[PDB]
Every structure is written in structure tokens, then in C-alpha cells.
Ligand binder design. Structure first.
Ligand code: HEM
Ligand code: HEM
Ligand SMILES: Cc1cc(CCNCc2ccc3c(C)cc(N)nc3c2)ccc1C#N
Ligand SMILES: Cc1cc(CCNCc2ccc3c(C)cc(N)nc3c2)ccc1C#N
Ligand SMILES: C[C@H](O)[C@H](O)[C@H]1CNc2nc(N)[nH]c(=O)c2N1
Ligand SMILES: C[C@H](O)[C@H](O)[C@H]1CNc2nc(N)[nH]c(=O)c2N1
Ligand SMILES: [Cl-]
Ligand SMILES: [Cl-]
Ligand SMILES: [Gd]
Ligand SMILES: [Gd]
Ligand SMILES: [Zn+2]
Lengths: 404, 404
């Protein structure tokens, strides 16, 4: 039972929950690879064992373990799989599982919210046109005029034989990335290839560096088809700074809904290759990673010139200055636009509050220190000073091969 | 079957083949990662097997592997263990061994410099008194009027029949920390304990915030003897801000020389429980950590208030702005005072070049990601976007329990 220490306060806890971890990670006694982005690189009696485990923790969570429908529910799943091969989750189960998977995501710092999540059951989806509308309710419910609300939309569970439901964008909202003669990129370089894939599937390209990509929706077997997004659904926030009057002129924007459409949801041994979830942003996500990363928008030097900073020596800390202002402008702009956004201090502190809750409840909490600590001011936040154990619980969100 | 490691800023891929030589064992299993633990740790035949390895490394590096002088040294060593249960390092072997320990230190961002290390051989040392003299000398050579040099002093190896040489002080230069009427601490809270010890061993405490502590030096089978550092030996840098003239009225200071004095040095099974070593500071250790940590000097709010920042709300990023100014002061005061210092941007850049040097050389490089990334501006620096393999090689520096 790992002794975990907090070094800011001197407190000590034990992670007993780690004990019940299953799907083995990447690390060994001889070398730690906790800093890898992809940990686990990418006869049906394995289905049942995973299934009984989820069902047991389901009834555990409602007290009704032992006797009652608990006893009963084990048989239905048993018989279902015995007959069919796969099984269907009761609707309440699918809601329980989806929340658990969130609660088990080690790299997410928003888990203090894990209990408040809106699940939309689209297991009766059957078409790309059908997927599209489902996506469009979600985005509408999630966005909610900038009063953002955590939502997941679950599409049919992958079944033995015959193809998957899948979304080809990594997110629902993505800006375009265009190559050229230079080999450089106008727009967002993170989305250069999916822009490549859009155009070659019949999308008329665009102007420049904030062009919302269209979706690519893949119904089982049948190849993908584009689906243009309604401009009013895709809520955005133009970027201005509270005191640096020139910032708006730079013409920076960013969307309101972070919504991931490529990760694979697993509950009770069932794989959902299409299960888009959305929450709301932490400001450093936009201000530090998306706009400042050398391989993203890389705007840091442009902001620094306009601030008339000394970019000639790295010891003026012009990078650190520019970056704080780019962050101040993000929080400001989202607030002016009355769109839900959380700063990193506010967020990390709430995560600490989550760790203590998760101690009392489950005897621990799987966390990925490198992803929980923010990309700026790491040591200024409490989670820097907090030892963390990382492991894999089910249900969870996994990564999956892209469909190319 | 060697770890694939990717640089996410540039897209580079390399495999860490050096990790498969990992001579000791870390805290991680495939069930759970524990890389965020500060303390990831805690017979003649084994002393031989460690020793043979070191000797092998040594004769590899002088391009004289598998030769007369090599097999000589093996036979000589494994026969000296027979007669005494120990063996002695030749001086050249000691110098190579001290560098390697630095080279292998996974938590050191300044390893680009590993080859330029001045090794003082004090294995003939005889008392706590000769010990003090050797230390004063180390401080004098290393400080060098503000133009700092890397050195290490190696006191006599742990041996059968005798007690250890031990320096009780975590670092050669440390500020006192005094408990209070409030129950609070005056000066540096990291050194409340050592301060307690010094006082009880006859030191006459001051009452300032930057009272330099005396040394407690332990010669074999002797109580620790207390030694005052000659004031003119301890070069300090008074902290001022280049455009916030009220800053100098904080009365903040720091010392030039980061000399760690309580770590064990391990060479071919031989253990040196006293071998103080020193480099020069990276500005964040002073700016971010030593001053802004809530549990250290904790000046963050007091600076931010003085900056007339709005400390009511976190979304104002008051913590981040105040921190960036504290760092700017550190780099500036030190540059003014003509006292060597490196910024985290410059530091992280040379570390990347180190990783590149190391891959060509040994096919890899041990690195603790969460230590390498600066406690501010992580993603702004290149080490944020680099995956790293953590493992233990020998020679090495290790933590060791306090002798009290
Ligand atoms: C509601 C507010 C939320 C906040 C503030 C939040 C915060 C974050 C942040 C900052 C990340 C880092 C991702 C990155 O930097 O690339 C993250 C990742 C993640 N979040 Fe949350 N999140 C929220 C909602 C949700 C919801 C609703 C779910 C699932 C239903 C979720 C599950 C995840 C997962 C699985 C990851 C890992 C992403 C990956 O590995 O690519 N989060 N979260
Ligand atoms: C010359 C410039 C040097 C720089 C800029 C530098 C930088 C650093 C920094 C920033 C840390 C982390 C400190 C902390 O987080 O508390 C560290 C740790 C460490 N460094 Fe270096 N260093 C230098 C020289 C040296 C030398 C000369 C040695 C040994 C011969 C060394 C060996 C180590 C070791 C063993 C650690 C781990 C200390 C621990 O675990 O507490 N470094 N270094
Ligand atoms: C595997 C991978 C992962 C990532 C990170 C993607 N995760 C982004 C994300 C995903 C979900 C979020 C959610 C749900 C909320 C939020 N505030 N931010 C979120 C951010 C980037 C590139 C790769 C790659 N290759
Ligand atoms: C185990 C432990 C470790 C640390 C880390 C302290 N390391 C300090 C250090 C040690 C050597 C340095 C060197 C050699 C150079 C440099 N710039 N900074 C250095 C800083 C702090 C508290 C504890 C505790 N308890
Ligand atoms: C190699 C390293 O793990 C990688 O760059 C990680 C570090 N931490 C991160 N943390 C978050 N939230 N998002 C990221 O993309 C990354 N990148
Ligand atoms: C618990 C946590 O890992 C701990 O506070 C670490 C994080 N990374 C660090 N990195 C460095 N360089 N120095 C440190 O003291 C720490 N502290
Ligand atoms: Cl994003
Ligand atoms: Cl220090
Ligand atoms: Gd101007
Ligand atoms: Gd001024
Ligand atoms: Zn690990």
C-alpha cells in the first residue's frame, strides 16, 4: 500500500485503491515511463469476467449488493452473453459507468465534477445523418449559450463482426491547418492531417487561421461523409486583453466547448469507439498549450514584440511575461463573453479537494502528476507538492487507433 | 523491446537502449507508477559484482577494455576484498567515478557540464578538524569570487571497523529557521531541525531571517563537532529588482553556492557517506522554490500586494505575475553581483543538447521528467515536450538517512 506524502502540509495517506488495479501500465521496477503520452500501445470469456466486475461495483454503489436484483442481474448478463456473445447495459448502468470512467481518468483535473454529468443514450443510432444530429443536440446542450455543462453521448457498442461507429476529428470543434510552398502551416498545425482528410473527402478549403473544420462521420462499414457545422452552434470567443489595447487586433479566437470525439469508452468489457464527451476549459489549455506551443499557434514571440520586451536574451523572461498576459486575456475574454472558464489555481485547488473526498470514499485516486500539474506556474499550485499514484481502473477512457 | 521515446515539439523518435543496463530497482510496477515520489527508494560476492562492473566502465572509457591492466585490476580488486572485505579506488578511478555519478543523476538539469568537475581527494582525512579545512577549501575554490566552478570533495569511504564521516548539514550554506511564540518559523523553515541540533550542540542562535548556520561535522565514532563558517567565505547576493525599487526593502538575500552535503556517493560497491558537491544555481530554485513555496519563505502574496495586484481573485493570475517578478530579481541581482547563475530557459536548452550528446554516447539518458521540467513555464521550455525514461545507473548519488 503506497505511502503518499504531501510536502506542502506534511500529511500522509495510503493508496489502498491501487491494490485493485488491473490493466497493467508501462512501468517496471527497472525503469519508469510515466512521462509517456501513450502508455499502453495500440474465447470471449474475457467479456464475462470484465462484465461481472462492473455489475458488482454497480450494486456496491447503490448499497444493493447481496440479494435482491443484484443476484438476479448477474444471470441476465450471463444468459445474454451465453446466447448472443455480447450483452446490453441497462440505461442506469451506462450512466453509472460513464461517470466512473470519468472518475477513473488519471490525467483529468476536473474530476471534482465527476458526479454531475449528462449522458445521452444514442445506442439506437443507425446512420451518419443520425450521428450528426445526436452530435448536434450534445453541442447544443453542452454549450448552452456559454453556461457549459458536462455531457457525454454514447453510440452503439462495437459488436462482433461488422464495422464501428467512429468520429474522425479528435474534437468536435477543430480549426483548420493548411500546408504550402514553405511547408509551413496557416492555421492550427495540430489539425493539419485531418484537414488533409477533409478536403480529399470533398470539403472546399478556407481563408486562414481560425476556420472551423467540418466533421467526418463514419457509420458502420459505409465510408465517412462530411457534415458541415452550423455557425450558430459552434460558439466562439474572440480574444482581447483588459489593458493591452492592441491584443484584439492580433485577431485571436478560440472555441467554447472542449469536446473529445476519438477516445474509446469501456464499461463492463464493452467497447464504445464513438463516445464524445465535453466539459469546459481550463485557461492554460488555451492560453499556454494551444496558442503558445512551438508546434501549435506559436504566438509567444509576436505577443512579446507588441509588449516591447527584450527578446534578445532569454534571461529577461520575456517568454514567461508574454505567456502570463496571453493567459490573462483568455480568462478575461471568456468572462466578458460570459463563457464558463476555470483558471489553473482554481482548478488545481479543486483537485486537491477531490483527492481528499476520494480518500474517504475509495481509499485513493489514480492521478498522472505530469498531466495534473499545470503547464505554467506548476509549483505555484498545490498539486505540484503532492505525491500521486497512477494506475488503470475500469470503467475508463482509453485511446484507440485512428481509422487510417 | 527498448522504450520508444518521442519529442513532441519536433516529432523526433529515439529508443532508450541504455535503460536495459539499469543496475538497481525503482518504485514502479506495471500495476502502478510511482515516479512522483520524492523518495523512490527506502556480502563479499555482491561487492565484487558491483566492483567488476565499475572497473569495466573505467577501462571502457580509457579505450583499454579487456587488456592486461584491466584484468590485472580485477584480480587485484577481487583479491583485496579477500584480505580486508573492501578495496581502494585509484585516484583516476575516483575522478571518473565522481563524474559518472553526476552524469547518471536523473534529477539534474545541468548535466551538460558533467565532464568539467573538480575532484578533491580527501580520503586521507583524519578528523572533524581536517574535515572542516577541506570544506572551507571547497567553498573557496567553488565560489571563486562569484565566478563559480563545479567541484566535489570526497572524504574517506565507509569501512569495516570504523564509523562514517558524516556532514549533518543538508547543504554547506543554509539559513537558520527559528520556531516562535506564534508557533511559526523565522527564516528558512526547511532547516528548523538542523537549527535545533546546532543550538543544542552549543551554537548561539541569532534572530534574523538569513542567519547562516554553522557546520556539524562528524568524524568516525565521535559526537558531531560544531564549526563556524568564516563570514568572508560565504558569498551572498542581496536581492533587488531592476524596476521595482521597493523590492530591495524586502531585505531578501541568497547565497552563491549550492553545495549539497548529505548525499551518499556510490562507486563500484564502495560508499562515500561524505562527499559534498556543488554547481551553481538555476534561478527558479531561488525565485520559485526557496522563496515562493508556502512552506519555505512564502513571499508570494507580500510581493503581489506590493505590486498592487488584485489578490482577491485567482483569475487575476496574481500568483503568476508576482512569481515572474521574483525570478527576474534573482537573475538580476546575481548578474549585478557578478555571481554565476542560469535561467530555466537557458538551463533546459542545454539539457536538450545533453540528451542528444547522451544518445550518441550510451544510447540513452536517465531523466526524471517531473524534476527536469522547471517549476514554472514548463511547456514554455523544451523539456516539457520530451518523453523521458527514469532509471538508476552506477556510479550514483543516493539519499541516505540523517545520522540523528
Ligand atoms: C467540466 C470540466 C472539466 C475540466 C476543467 C477538465 C479538465 C481537464 C484537463 C485540463 C485535461 C488535460 C487535457 C490536455 O491538456 O490535453 C483533461 C483531460 C481529460 N479529461 Fe477532463 N475536464 C472536464 C470535464 C471532463 C469530462 C466531462 C470528462 C469525461 C466524461 C473528462 C475526462 C477526461 C479525460 C478522459 C482526459 C484525458 C484526455 C487525454 O488523455 O487525451 N473531463 N481534463
Ligand atoms: C553547474 C551547474 C548545475 C546546475 C545548473 C544544476 C542543476 C540542478 C537542479 C536545478 C537540480 C534540482 C534541484 C532541486 O530541484 O532541488 C539538480 C539536482 C541534482 N544535481 Fe545538478 N546542477 C549543477 C551541477 C551539479 C553538480 C556539480 C553535481 C554533482 C557532481 C550535480 C548533481 C545533482 C544531483 C545528484 C541532483 C539530485 C539532488 C537531489 O536529488 O536532491 N549537479 N541539479
Ligand atoms: C494522445 C494525445 C492526447 C492529447 C491531449 C488530448 N486531450 C485533450 C482534452 C480532452 C478532453 C478535455 C476535456 C473533457 C475537458 C477539458 N477542459 N480539456 C480537455 C482536453 C494530445 C495529443 C495526443 C496525441 N497523439
Ligand atoms: C530528499 C529531498 C530532496 C530535496 C531536493 C534538494 N536538492 C537540492 C540541490 C542539490 C544539488 C544541487 C546542485 C548540485 C546544483 C543546483 N543548482 N542545485 C542543487 C540543488 C529537497 C528536500 C528533500 C527532502 N526531504
Ligand atoms: C512528454 C510529456 O509527458 C508530454 O509532453 C505531456 C506532459 N504533460 C501534459 N499535460 C497535459 N495536460 N497535456 C499534455 O499534452 C501534456 N503533455
Ligand atoms: C511530490 C512532487 O513530485 C515534488 O514536489 C517534486 C516535483 N518536482 C520537483 N522538481 C524539482 N526539480 N525539484 C523538486 O523539489 C520537485 N519536487
Ligand atoms: Cl484544446
Ligand atoms: Cl536550495
Ligand atoms: Gd508602440
Ligand atoms: Gd519603478
Ligand atoms: Zn513509473
Amino acid at each position: 500500500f503506497p505511502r503518499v506524502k504531501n510536502w506542502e502540509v506534511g500529511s500522509i495517506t495510503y493508496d489502498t485503491l491501487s491494490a485493485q488495479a488491473q490493466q497493467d501500465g508501462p512501468c517496471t521496477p527497472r525503469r519508469c515511463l510515466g512521462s509517456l503520452v501513450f502508455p499502453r500501445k495500440l474465447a470471449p470469456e474475457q467479456l464475462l469476467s470484465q462484465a461481472r466486475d462492473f455489475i458488482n461495483q454497480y450494486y456496491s454503489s447503490i448499497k444493493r449488493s447481496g440479494s435482491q436484483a443484484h443476484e438476479q442481474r448477474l444471470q441476465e448478463v450471463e444468459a445474454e452473453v451465453a446466447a448472443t456473445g455480447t450483452y446490453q447495459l441497462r440505461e442506469s448502468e451506462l450512466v453509472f459507468g460513464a461517470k466512473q470512467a470519468w472518475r477513473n481518468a488519471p490525467r483529468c483535473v476536473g474530476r471534482i465534477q465527476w458526479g454531475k454529468l449528462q449522458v445521452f443514450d444514442a445506442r439506437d443510432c443507425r446512420s451518419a445523418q443520425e450521428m450528426f444530429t445526436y452530435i448536434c443536440n450534445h453541442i447544443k446542450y453542452a454549450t448552452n449559450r456559454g453556461n457549459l455543462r458536462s455531457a457525454i453521448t454514447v453510440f452503439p457498442q462495437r459488436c462482433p463482426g461488422r464495422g464501428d461507429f467512429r468520429i474522425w476529428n479528435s474534437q468536435l470543434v477543430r480549426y483548420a491547418g493548411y500546408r504550402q510552398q514553405d511547408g509551413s502551416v496557416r492555421g492550427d498545425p495540430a489539425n493539419v492531417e485531418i484537414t488533409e482528410l477533409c478536403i480529399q473527402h470533398g470539403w472546399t478549403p478556407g481563408n486562414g487561421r481560425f476556420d472551423v473544420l467540418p466533421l467526418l462521420l463514419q457509420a458502420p462499414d459505409e465510408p465517412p461523409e462530411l457534415f458541415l457545422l452550423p455557425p450558430e452552434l459552434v460558439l466562439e470567443v474572440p480574444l482581447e486583453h483588459p489593458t493591452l489595447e492592441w491584443f484584439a487586433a492580433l485577431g485571436l479566437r478560440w472555441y467554447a466547448l472542449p469536446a473529445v470525439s476519438n477516445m474509446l469508452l469501456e464499461i463492463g468489457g464493452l467497447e464504445f469507439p464513438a463516445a464524445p464527451f465535453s466539459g469546459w476549459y481550463m485557461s492554460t489549455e488555451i492560453g499556454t498549450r494551444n496558442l503558445c506551443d512551438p508546434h501549435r499557434y506559436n504566438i509567444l514571440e509576436d505577443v512579446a514584440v507588441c509588449m516591447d520586451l527584450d527578446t534578445r536574451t532569454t534571461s529577461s523572461l520575456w517568454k514567461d511575461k508574454a505567456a502570463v498576459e496571453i493567459n490573462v486575456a483568455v480568462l478575461h475574454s471568456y468572462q466578458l463573453a460570459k463563457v464558463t472558464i476555470v483558471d489553473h489555481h482554481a482548478a488545481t485547488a479543486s483537485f486537491m479537494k477531490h483527492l481528499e473526498n476520494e480518500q474517504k470514499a475509495r481509499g485513493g485516486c489514480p492521478a498522472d502528476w505530469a498531466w495534473i500539474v499545470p503547464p505554467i506556474s506548476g509549483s505555484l499550485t498545490p498539486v505540484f507538492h503532492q505525491e500521486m499514484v497512477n494506475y488503470f481502473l475500469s470503467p475508463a477512457f482509453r485511446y484507440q487507433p485512428d481509422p487510417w
